[PDB]
Amino acid sequence: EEKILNREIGFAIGMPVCEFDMVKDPEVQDFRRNILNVCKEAVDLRDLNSPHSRAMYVYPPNVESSPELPKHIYNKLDKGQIIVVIWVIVSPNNDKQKYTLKINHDCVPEQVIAEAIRKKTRSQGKYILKVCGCDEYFLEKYPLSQYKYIRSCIMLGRMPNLMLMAKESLYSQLPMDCFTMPSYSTKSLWVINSALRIKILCATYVNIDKIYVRTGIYHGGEPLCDNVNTQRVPCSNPRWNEWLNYDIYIPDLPRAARLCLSICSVKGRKEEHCPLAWGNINLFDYTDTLVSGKMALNLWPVPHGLEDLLNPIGVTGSNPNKETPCLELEFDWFSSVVKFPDMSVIEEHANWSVRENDKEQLKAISTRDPLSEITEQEKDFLWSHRHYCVTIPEILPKLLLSVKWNSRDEVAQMYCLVKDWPPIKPEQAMELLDCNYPDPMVRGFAVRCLEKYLTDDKLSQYLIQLVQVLKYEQYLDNLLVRFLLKKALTNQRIGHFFFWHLKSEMHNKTVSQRFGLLLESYCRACGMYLKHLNRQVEAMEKLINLTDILKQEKKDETQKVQMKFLVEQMRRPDFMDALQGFLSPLNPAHQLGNLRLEECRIMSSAKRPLWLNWENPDIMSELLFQNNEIIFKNGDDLRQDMLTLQIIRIMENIWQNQGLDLRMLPYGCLSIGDCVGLIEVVRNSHTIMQIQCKGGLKGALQFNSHTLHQWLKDKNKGEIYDAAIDLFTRSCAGYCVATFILGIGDRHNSNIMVKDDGQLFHIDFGHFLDHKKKKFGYKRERVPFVLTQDFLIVISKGAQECTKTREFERFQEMCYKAYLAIRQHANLFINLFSMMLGSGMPELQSFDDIAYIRKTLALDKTEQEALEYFMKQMNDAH
Ligand SMILES: Nc1ncc(-c2nc(N3CCOCC3)nc(N[C@@]3(CO)CCN(C(=O)OCC(F)F)C3)c2F)cn1
Numbered sequence: 001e002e003k004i005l006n007r008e009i010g011f012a013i014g015m016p017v018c019e020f021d022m023v024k025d026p027e028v029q030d031f032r033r034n035i036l037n038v039c040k041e042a043v044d045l046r047d048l049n050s051p052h053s054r055a056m057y058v059y060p061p062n063v064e065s066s067p068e069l070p071k072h073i074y075n076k077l078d079k080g081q082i083i084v085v086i087w088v089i090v091s092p093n094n095d096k097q098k099y100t101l102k103i104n105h106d107c108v109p110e111q112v113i114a115e116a117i118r119k120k121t122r123s124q125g126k127y128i129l130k131v132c133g134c135d136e137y138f139l140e141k142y143p144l145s146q147y148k149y150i151r152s153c154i155m156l157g158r159m160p161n162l163m164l165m166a167k168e169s170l171y172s173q174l175p176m177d178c179f180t181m182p183s184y185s186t187k188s189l190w191v192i193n194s195a196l197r198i199k200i201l202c203a204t205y206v207n208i209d210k211i212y213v214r215t216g217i218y219h220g221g222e223p224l225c226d227n228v229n230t231q232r233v234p235c236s237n238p239r240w241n242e243w244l245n246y247d248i249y250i251p252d253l254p255r256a257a258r259l260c261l262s263i264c265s266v267k268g269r270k271e272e273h274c275p276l277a278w279g280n281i282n283l284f285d286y287t288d289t290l291v292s293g294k295m296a297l298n299l300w301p302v303p304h305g306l307e308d309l310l311n312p313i314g315v316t317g318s319n320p321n322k323e324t325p326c327l328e329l330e331f332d333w334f335s336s337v338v339k340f341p342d343m344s345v346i347e348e349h350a351n352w353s354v355r356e357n358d359k360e361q362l363k364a365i366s367t368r369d370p371l372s373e374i375t376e377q378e379k380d381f382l383w384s385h386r387h388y389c390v391t392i393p394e395i396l397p398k399l400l401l402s403v404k405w406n407s408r409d410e411v412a413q414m415y416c417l418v419k420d421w422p423p424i425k426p427e428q429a430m431e432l433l434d435c436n437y438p439d440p441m442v443r444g445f446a447v448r449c450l451e452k453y454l455t456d457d458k459l460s461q462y463l464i465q466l467v468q469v470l471k472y473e474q475y476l477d478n479l480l481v482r483f484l485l486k487k488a489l490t491n492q493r494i495g496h497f498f499f500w501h502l503k504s505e506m507h508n509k510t511v512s513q514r515f516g517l518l519l520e521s522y523c524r525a526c527g528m529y530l531k532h533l534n535r536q537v538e539a540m541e542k543l544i545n546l547t548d549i550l551k552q553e554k555k556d557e558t559q560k561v562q563m564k565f566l567v568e569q570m571r572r573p574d575f576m577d578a579l580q581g582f583l584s585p586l587n588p589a590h591q592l593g594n595l596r597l598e599e600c601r602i603m604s605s606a607k608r609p610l611w612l613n614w615e616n617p618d619i620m621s622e623l624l625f626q627n628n629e630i631i632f633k634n635g636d637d638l639r640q641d642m643l644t645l646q647i648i649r650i651m652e653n654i655w656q657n658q659g660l661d662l663r664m665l666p667y668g669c670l671s672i673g674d675c676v677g678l679i680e681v682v683r684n685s686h687t688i689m690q691i692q693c694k695g696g697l698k699g700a701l702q703f704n705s706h707t708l709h710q711w712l713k714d715k716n717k718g719e720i721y722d723a724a725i726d727l728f729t730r731s732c733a734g735y736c737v738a739t740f741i742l743g744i745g746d747r748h749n750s751n752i753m754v755k756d757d758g759q760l761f762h763i764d765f766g767h768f769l770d771h772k773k774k775k776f777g778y779k780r781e782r783v784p785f786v787l788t789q790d791f792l793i794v795i796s797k798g799a800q801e802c803t804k805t806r807e808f809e810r811f812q813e814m815c816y817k818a819y820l821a822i823r824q825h826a827n828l829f830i831n832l833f834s835m836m837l838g839s840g841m842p843e844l845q846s847f848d849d850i851a852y853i854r855k856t857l858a859l860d861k862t863e864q865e866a867l868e869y870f871m872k873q874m875n876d877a878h
Pocket residue numbers: 603604605606609631633636638641667679680681682683684685686687750751753763764765766
C-alpha cells in the first residue's frame with residue numbers, strides 16, 4: 001500500500017524513506033508535514049479543468065516566452081504564412097496519410113485542425129495535434145509559431161510534421177490522481193540589553209603544535225563583528241570550557257545571523273594557520289527562536305582551495321556523519337524563549353529611528369555588475385539616498401549591501417523600504433537569492449518577483465541556478481522551495497529536470513538531507529511519473545556500473561578487448577531489460593525503445609565515453625529521427641557543460657532579438673550524478689580533424705589549412721554553396737565571440753565540429769574561465785581568441801589573401817556587434833556564474849574565475865575602449 005510507494009520513492013532518491021523517519025530534528029519533521037500543503041495545492045490545480053488541465057500537466061506546451069517574431073524570422077515565412085504537414089493514421093492497414101496546409105504563422109492549434117479536417121473531407125472539436133516522432137502535444141491556444149518545434153522549423157528551413165489525434169485517445173491514457181497523504185502527517189530579542197557571548201566547551205574526534213577554535217558572527221559572508229578565538233591547546237586535550245565574548249549586542253543581531261566555527265591548527269616553523277574542520281550555526285532557528293543552551297555540532301571537511309580560516313558561505317548545520325570532529329557549545333538562556341520581533345514591532349522601531357549630479361551618480365552605481373566594487377563612500381552615499389532609490393528599483397542589490405546589518409536601526413528601516421519596493425525583472429531578482437543576501441525579507445521579495453514575472457520557459461532556462469541557490473537558504477521550509485516544488489508538481493517537464501537537478505547532487509553530503517527531503521515530497525505527489533523516473537534511474541545505474549568497471553578494472557586493455565566486455569555485459573538479460581523501454585533523461589518526450597547494440601561503441605575521446613543508440617519506437621519516427629543517439633560519459637563534471645550550453649542559448653537569444661542571425665548549437669546535456677551524465681549527439685556532424693584526415697594523405701603533413709573549405713564545396717554544389725559559406729561565417733562568428741568571452745579551452749580540431757550545411761559548433765566545456773595556453777605552436781595559434789587559418793579560407797570562399805577580402809570585413813563586423821550585444825547584458829552573465837560559485841565545479845571555485853569575464857568583456861573600460869580591446873584580440877589571432 002504505502003509500503004510499496006515508500007520502497008519506490010527510496011529507489012528514486014537512492015535513500016530509504018525510513019532514514020527520514022529516524023531523524024529527530026523537529027525542523028526535518030515539520031518540513032515533511034508542512035510541505036504536503038504544496039502537494040495538495042498542485043494536485044488540486046491539476047484537476048481544476050480535468051481532464052484537459054491534467055493533460056497539460058503531463059504534456060505541457062513547449063513554447064517560447066513571446067509570440068513576437070524578430071523581423072528576420074518573419075522574413076523566412078512566405079508572406080507571413082507557414083507550410084505544415086498534417087498526418088492521420090486511417091486504419092485498417094494503419095496507413096499514413098498526409099495533408100499539406102499553408103496557414104498564417106500565428107494560427108492557434110484549433111484553426112490548424114479545422115483546416116486539416118477541411119482538406120481531408122474535400123475528396124468538430126474532438127482532436128489534438130502531436131509532433132510526429134515524439135510525445136510533444138499542442139494542447140494550448142498559443143499561436144503555432146510560438147511552439148518551440150514550429151519556431152525551430154521556421155528558423156531551420158524545415159517542414160513541420162504534426163499528427164492529428166483523437167482527444168479521447170490521449171485523455172483515456174492519463175492515469176488517475178494517486179496523491180495520498182503519508183502516515184507521518186516569550187521574550188522579544190530586543191528586550192535583552194547584553195552583548196553576545198558563546199561558550200566553547202570541548203571537541204571529540206580530534207586526534208601539530210596547537211589547536212584552537214576560530215569563531216565569527218556573519219550575515220551572508222560578511223562579518224558582523226571581529227572574529228574571536230579560544231586559547232590554543234596542545235592537540236591531545238581539546239577542552240576549552242571558555243566563554244567567547246563578541247562586540248555585538250543581542251538586539252543588533254539580524255534575523256539571518258550565523259555563528260561560523262572552525263578548528264584550526266598552528267605550526268611554528270611565520271606562524272602557519274590551517275583549518276581542520278568547519279561548521280556554521282544559524283543563531284535563530286526555523287521558528288525565529290534565538291538559540292540557547294547546550295548544543296553539539298559535527299564539523300565538515302575543508303573544501304579544496306578555501307584560502308581562509310572560516311567558511312561563512314558553507315552550508316549550515318551538523319554533519320550527518322557523527323564520527324567526525326564534534327564541538328560542544330553553550331548559549332545563554334534568558335529565563336524565557338527569546339523570539340525575533342514581529343513585523344509590526346520592527347515597523348514601530350523604524351519610524352522611531354527617523355541634486356542632478358547625484359541622480360546621475362545613483363544611476364551609474366545601479367548599472368554596475370554584481371562583482372564591481374562598491375566603496376565605503378558609495379555605501380554611505382546610497383544609504384543616505386535610500387528614499388530616492390525606490391525610483392531606480394534595479395539598485396536594490398547595491399542598496400542592500402550598503403545597510404549595516406549589525407545595526408537593528410538601519411535594518412528596521414531597510415525592511416520598510418523592501419516592503420514597498422517596486423517589483424523587478426527575474427534576471428535582477430535572481431541576484432537577491434545568491435549567498436550575499438541571506439535576509440528572509442530580501443529573499444521573499446525576490447521569490448515574489450519570480451512568481452509574478454517568470455514564464456514556465458524562463459523558469460526551465462534558469463532552473464540550474466534556482467536549485468543551486470536552495471543550498472543558501474537558512475531553513476528547509478522557505479518561499480523559494482515552495483515555489484519550485486509547486487512548479488515542478490504542475491508542469492511535468494519542469495518536474496523531470498527539477499528531479500534530475502536534485503538527484504544528481506545526492507552524493508554531496510552537505511545537501512543530501514535537504515535535497516533528499518525535497519525529493520521525497522516531489523516523488524510522493526508527481527503521480528505515475530515516478531514509475532518512469534525509476535526506469536530512468538535503473539538504466540543510469542546500469543551504465544554507471546558498466547563505465548566504472550571499464551575505467552577501474554579494464555582501463556588499460558585495447559579497444560577490441562574493451563568492446564568484447566561491453567557487448568557481453570550489454571547482452572545480459574537484466575541489462576537489456578533495464579536499458580530498453582524508458583524515456584530519455586535529456587528530453588522525456590523521446591522514448592528509448594530497443595538498444596541497437598551493433599551501433600553502440602566505446603569512443604576514443606578523453607575518459608572513453610559511451611556512444612549509445614536506441615530505436616525511436618514512435619509510429620512516425622521517420623519524420624523526426626529513426627534512432628536516438630546519446631553519449632553517456634563517466635569522468636566529467638557535466639554541470640560546467642550545462643552552464644556553458646545555457647549561456648550559449650541566452651547569447652543566441654540576445655543576438656537573434658537584435659537582428660543578428662548568429663546560429664548557435666546548444667545541444668542537450670544533463671548531469672545525472674557525480675561526474676556522470678548524458679550528451680545529445682548532433683546528427684550529420686564531423687570534427688575538423690575528421691574532415692582533415694579525409695582530404696589528408698598517408699605519410700604527408702596532416703592538419704592542412706585548406707581541407708575544410710574543399711569538403712564543404714563537395715557537400716554544397718550550386719546555389720546551396722553560398723548559403724553554406726554564410727551559415728559557416730555566422731556560426732563561426734558566434735562561437736569565436738562566445739569561446740573568447742567565456743575563455744573556453746582545449747579548442748583542438750576534435751572539439752570543433754561542422755555539419756554538412758556549413759554549421760559550425762563547439763563541444764566539451766571542461767575548461768572555461770581561463771586562458772589555457774598550449775605548450776608549443778605559433779604565436780597566433782596560442783592567443784585567447786581562437787580563429788584558425790582553415791576557417792578564414794571558408795569565410796573568404798577560397799581566397800589566398802583571406803584577411804583582405806570583403807567577406808572577412810563582414811565577418812569582423814559580425815564579431816564586433818556580437819561582442820557589444822553581450823557586453824550590454826554582462827550583469828546577467830556575471831550573475832549566472834556567480835549563482836553557481838558554490839557548486840564545486842572544478843573550473844569555477846572563486847570570484848577570480850568569474851573576473852575572467854569582467855576582463856574579456858572589459859567592464860572596467862568604456863564601450864569604445866572595450867571594442868578596441870576586442871579588436872586587438874581578434875587581430876592577435878591572424
Ligand atoms: N564534456 C563533453 N562534451 C562533449 C563531448 C563529446 N561530444 C561529442 N558530440 C558529438 C556531436 O554532438 C554533440 C556532442 N562528440 C564527442 N566525441 C567525438 C567528437 O570529438 C569523437 C568522434 N565522434 C564522432 O565521430 O561523432 C559522430 C558525429 F556525431 F560527430 C564524436 C565528445 F567527446 C564529451 N565530453
